[PDB]
């Protein structure tokens, strides 16, 4: 396996960013997931070599940090907060609306590999509960009609 | 162009930490400079590091990350050890109900940056870090851009403003682990490893990043540093009560009419936070409980306590989650149990098994599928997560749930 030049350049940029190469591990993994829509298991070996780290170390790091997904490829990750404030304010209403629009439940991917619902702990926007993210973008859920309009922006 | 951020409501009675951050938008270097920004840095570079530590010590600034340790004293402890030294800004946030740090990061990044430069100068650190949770991508891009602006204006790099002081601020991203907010697990993550906490002592000020003296401070703590230098420690100490001085951010959520961040003095009571500032409860319903993040639970009888770091005070990070009369306390306790179950790093056996069992048995109780043994097991597990624990997570994973059991016995009894 080989990374495309547009990704390799970005990974080398992160590797050259911190004083020590190994400190760039999480920035590199975020970059791999943003490019592929998941962490391809094949990417770990060339990443380990670039970081000058053993494969076992990299594998352990990917498994520890739960933002990284090695199982499902998805263009857009819908991160739904399932913590205390959002639960109290309407997480279930948000999940019901997501199921009506996309036909999927948490942990599932749409048949076109477009959306995955990812249940997550507090996203730190509790005053705007129930909270959800669509990749890097973050929103307060208001209603199904409002949610439908937000999701239509992700093509 | 940055990723979308919800527009969190912000209100201040002090116009300090929220002077700019009360407006839901990025304030760049020119706008910051127009307010007299980076002038406290200029004043600090004309002072000795030892004098800055003394001013910060005399200001009475205490850590805003949850433990309330005196900041000036933490710096003193670091500087007694030989260099090189490292400065770390803890921007992991992630505790349920807490959204105070992101509003400084996303709206007034230069206030934080200026604080980092002054603090790094005070402890003789030439390398500083911001460790921001992975779920704050906009905050990360805002900080990277603001650091570049600061570099371009000569506030960062080598020989800053001809002082002979060198500094580079690196921005690291977390990737889902709440435990990476614990300062030693944060250090492990910065070293490119799994976020596994290390036993304290040694405290980071003795052996931290690369085993070197390291100061770890919360975003909100650091945002106070330009004010201490700008006003002087005496005028800073005039804000709020003299024993718990300075501005404090209060993230208020749940069943309030006006949820958001409030900048208030620490002599404000919990009752005043809810009713005088957050506009009272939704539907004017009675307050049942206040969850201080995932740490404490206060009943409606405890609303008159001060929002300070005193023994009988609110403490924590000033995180206010309001629950009203119709909110199920057992259902609420289950969400707190699920949080700790998901976030234990698993190094310590009673924390690993205890966080899992507390949530698993509480789910059974809530769904009405629990046996008499599951009930007694839950009570025992809740009291036994703490033994042998390396860090604060294992020590507090059963704290809030135990308080709900003691303060709301009647409600827990219904589920039997
Ligand atoms: N903000 C959040 O996300 C969050 C999350 C969970 C818990 N909390 C809070 O975190 C607290 C526990 O955190 P902690 O384990 O870092 O607290 P701590 O009591 O161990 O120490 C707090 C700070 O003071 C320093 N310190 C303490 N004793 C020292 C000594 N003798 N010498 C030198 N430095 C010393 C520590 O290194 C640390 O930076 C709890 O009280 C809780 O309220 C906050
Ligand atoms: C499990 C756990 C999570 C923590 N998370 C954070 C956090 O997100 N931000 C923070 O600044 N401190 C957090 N802390 C406290 C830090 O370990 C540390 O006390 C703090 O960063 C020191 O800064 P301060 O003195 O300015 O408060 C956490 C502690 C524990 C036990
Ligand atoms: S107490 Fe829990 S979170 Fe802390 S080091 Fe031990 S297992 Fe990890
Ligand atoms: S509880 Fe959902 S954002 Fe905090
Ligand atoms: Cl190897
Ligand atoms: Cl104004
Ligand atoms: Na994290």
């Amino acid at each position: 396996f080989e990374f495309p030049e547009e990704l390799k350049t970005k990974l080398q940029e992160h590797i050259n960013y911190f004083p020590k190469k190994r400190q760039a591990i999480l920035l590199c993994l975020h970059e791999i997931q943003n490019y592929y829509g998941y962490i391809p298991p094949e990417s770990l070996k060339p990443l380990a070599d670039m970081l000058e780290l053993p494969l076992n170390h990299v594998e352990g790091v990917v498994a520890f940090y739960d933002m990284f997904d090695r199982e499902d490829k998805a263009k857009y990750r819908i991160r739904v907060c399932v913590s205390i404030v959002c639960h109290l304010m309407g997480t279930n209403k948000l999940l019901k609306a997501l199921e009506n629009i996309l036909g999927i439940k948490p942990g599932e991917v749409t048949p076109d590999g477009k959306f995955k619902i990812v249940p997550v702990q507090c996203l730190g926007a509790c005053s705007e509960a129930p909270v959800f993210m669509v990749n890097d973008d973050e929103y307060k859920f208001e209603s199904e009609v409002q949610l439908n309009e937000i999701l239509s922006r992700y093509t | 162009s940055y990723p979308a951020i919800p527009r969190i409501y912000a209100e201040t009675t002090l116009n300090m930490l929220l002077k700019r951050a009360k407006k839901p938008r990025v304030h760049s270097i020119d706008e910051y400079l127009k307010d007299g920004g980076y002038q406290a840095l200029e004043k600090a570079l004309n002072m000795s590091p030892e004098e800055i530590i003394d001013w910060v010590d005399k200001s009475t600034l205490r850590g805003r990350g949850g433990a309330g340790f005196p900041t000036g004293k933490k710096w003193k402890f670091a500087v007694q050890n030989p260099g090189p030294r490292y400065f770390i800004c803890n921007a992991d946030e992630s505790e349920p109900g807490t959204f105070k740090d992101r509003i400084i990061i996303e709206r007034d990044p230069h206030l934080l940056i200026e604080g980092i430069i002054i603090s790094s100068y005070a402890i003789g650190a030439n390398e500083a870090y911001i460790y921001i949770r992975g779920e704050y991508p906009a905050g990360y891009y805002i900080l990277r851009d603001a650091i570049e602006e600061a570099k371009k204006k000569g506030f960062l790099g080598k020989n800053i403003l001809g002082s002979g002081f060198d500094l580079e601020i690196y921005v690291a991203r977390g990737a889902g682990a709440y435990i990476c907010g614990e300062e030693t697990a944060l250090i492990e993550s910065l070293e490119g490893k799994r976020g596994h906490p290390r036993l304290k002592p040694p405290y980071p000020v003795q052996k931290g990043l690369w085993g070197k003296p390291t100061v770890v401070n919360n975003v909100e703590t650091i945002a106070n540093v330009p004010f201490i230098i700008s006003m002087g420690w005496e005028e800073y100490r005039y804000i709020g009560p003299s024993d718990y001085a300075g501005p404090k951010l209060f993230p208020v959520s749940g069943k309030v009419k006006k949820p958001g961040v409030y900048e208030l003095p620490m002599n404000t009571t919990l009752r005043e936070v809810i009713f005088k500032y957050a506009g009272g409860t939704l539907g004017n319903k009675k307050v049942k409980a206040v969850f201080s993040g995932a740490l404490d639970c206060f009943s409606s009888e405890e609303l008159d306590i001060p929002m300070d770091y005193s023994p009988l005070g609110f403490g924590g990070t000033g995180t206010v989650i309001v629950l009203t009369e119709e909110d199920d306390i057992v259902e609420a306790a289950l969400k707190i149990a699920e949080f700790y179950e998901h976030e234990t790093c698993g190094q310590c056996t009673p924390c690993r098994v205890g966080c899992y069992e507390q949530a698993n048995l509480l789910e059974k109780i809530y769904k009405g599928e629990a046996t008499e043994q599951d009930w007694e097991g839950f009570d025992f597990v809740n009291r036994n997560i703490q033994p042998t624990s390396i860090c604060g997570l294992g020590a507090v994973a059963g704290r809030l749930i135990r308080q709900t059991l003691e303060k709301f016995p009647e409600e827990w009894e219904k589920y039997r």
Side-chain angles (χ1 to χ4, degrees), chain A residues 17-20 22-23 25-27 30 57 64-68 84-85 87 121-127 136-138, chain B residues 3-4 8 97 99 102 127 129 133 137 170-171 173-176 189-190 192-193 195 259-260 331-332 339 342-343:
Chain A
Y17 179 67
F18 297 102
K20 296 193 186 171
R22 61 194 176 270
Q23 306 191 257
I25 192 153
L26 303 184
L27 283 179
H30 276 298
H57 180 120
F64 182 86
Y65 297 97
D66 85 322
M67 274 187 80
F68 307 133
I84 181 66
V85 195
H87 176 74
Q121 295 303 308
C122 181
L123 289 166
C126 320
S127 60
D136 284 0
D137 303 309
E138 186 164 84
Chain B
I8 290 156
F99 48 90
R102 70 176 306 162
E127 192 170 298
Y129 291 84
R133 70 176 301 190
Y170 302 95
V171 193
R173 289 183 77 195
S189 193
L190 274 184
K193 302 195 261 176
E331 187 177 33
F339 175 74
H342 192 86
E343 302 306 342

Side-chain angles (χ1 to χ4, degrees), chain A residues 1 3-12 28 31-33 35-36:
Chain A
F1 171 73
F3 291 117
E5 235 66 79
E6 59 180 295
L7 183 62
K8 201 184 179 181
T9 302
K10 288 178 182 182
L11 302 174
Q12 259 305 124
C28 286
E31 203 66 60
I32 293 161
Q33 186 149 290
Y35 185 74
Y36 293 102

Side-chain angles (χ1 to χ4, degrees), chain B residues 335-349:
Chain B
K335 304 288 116 171
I336 303 296
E338 285 172 350
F339 175 74
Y340 288 110
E341 176 205 4
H342 192 86
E343 302 306 342
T344 175
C345 81
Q347 278 194 100
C348 316
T349 296

Side-chain angles (χ1 to χ4, degrees), chain B residues 98-320:
Chain B
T98 318
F99 48 90
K100 65 185 187 74
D101 297 344
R102 70 176 306 162
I103 80 151
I104 296 162
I105 294 163
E106 295 163 340
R107 308 166 181 194
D108 202 14
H110 292 284
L111 177 63
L112 176 60
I113 297 166
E114 184 172 0
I116 293 161
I117 313 162
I118 298 165
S119 302
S120 296
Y121 174 69
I123 67 151
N126 305 111
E127 192 170 298
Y129 291 84
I130 299 176
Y131 185 92
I132 189 169
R133 70 176 301 190
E135 306 85 354
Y136 284 171
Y140 165 79
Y141 298 117
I142 289 155
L143 288 166
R144 288 291 314 263
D145 284 351
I147 285 157
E148 285 316 305
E149 287 188 302
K151 270 199 121 172
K152 285 155 186 185
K153 288 278 184 183
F155 303 126
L156 286 168
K158 283 197 203 170
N159 184 32
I160 299 157
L161 312 176
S163 68
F165 172 70
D166 302 345
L167 185 69
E168 292 293 332
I169 302 170
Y170 302 95
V171 193
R173 289 183 77 195
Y178 164 74
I179 198 55
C180 286
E182 196 280 341
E183 67 184 354
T184 68
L186 190 157
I187 288 158
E188 291 295 299
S189 193
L190 274 184
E191 292 182 12
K193 302 195 261 176
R194 290 143 89 194
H196 287 160
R198 296 200 81 205
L199 200 72
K200 294 185 292 185
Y203 286 96
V205 291
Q206 188 183 91
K207 283 187 177 196
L209 180 71
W210 311 123
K212 300 286 168 193
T214 303
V215 166
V216 183
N217 274 126
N218 174 257
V219 169
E220 201 196 341
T221 315
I222 300 156
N224 277 267
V225 172
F227 290 97
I228 296 153
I229 306 305
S230 188
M231 307 164 85
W233 63 271
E234 284 179 69
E235 280 188 319
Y236 176 89
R237 200 167 181 173
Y238 284 166
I239 299 126
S242 60
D243 55 348
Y244 303 103
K248 178 75 189 82
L249 300 186
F250 298 98
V252 191
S253 67
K255 306 298 183 77
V256 290
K257 288 193 198 71
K258 299 158 61 193
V261 188
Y262 292 87
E263 176 176 42
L264 304 164
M266 287 180 272
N267 63 323
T268 307
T269 69
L270 176 56
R271 186 184 300 280
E272 286 167 345
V273 170
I274 304 166
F275 297 97
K276 179 185 177 143
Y277 295 104
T281 61
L282 283 172
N284 300 295
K285 296 194 192 170
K286 281 157 99 288
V287 171
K288 178 182 262 188
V290 176
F291 279 16
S292 173
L295 180 73
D296 291 298
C297 174
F298 295 101
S299 71
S300 55
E301 277 191 283
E302 302 172 286
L303 298 181
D304 292 305
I305 64 167
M307 297 301 291
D308 60 12
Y309 295 108
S310 77
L312 299 165
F314 192 94
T317 46
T319 294
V320 180

